[PDB]
Amino acid sequence: RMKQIEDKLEEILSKLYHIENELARAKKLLG
């Protein structure tokens, strides 16, 4: 399916945002 695609994209992108948050934490803990 083509939406199914787009679906998975949306999820992948979601993970990326979280990773970006997780990196913001780690940069702060590094002073």
Q: Which residues bind its own copies (CB under 8 A)?
A: 1-6, 8-13, 15-20, 22-27, 29-31
DSSP string, 1-31: -HHHHHHHHHHHHHHHHHHHHHHHHHHHHT-
Structure tokens at 10: 């949306």
Tokens of 28: 């702060």
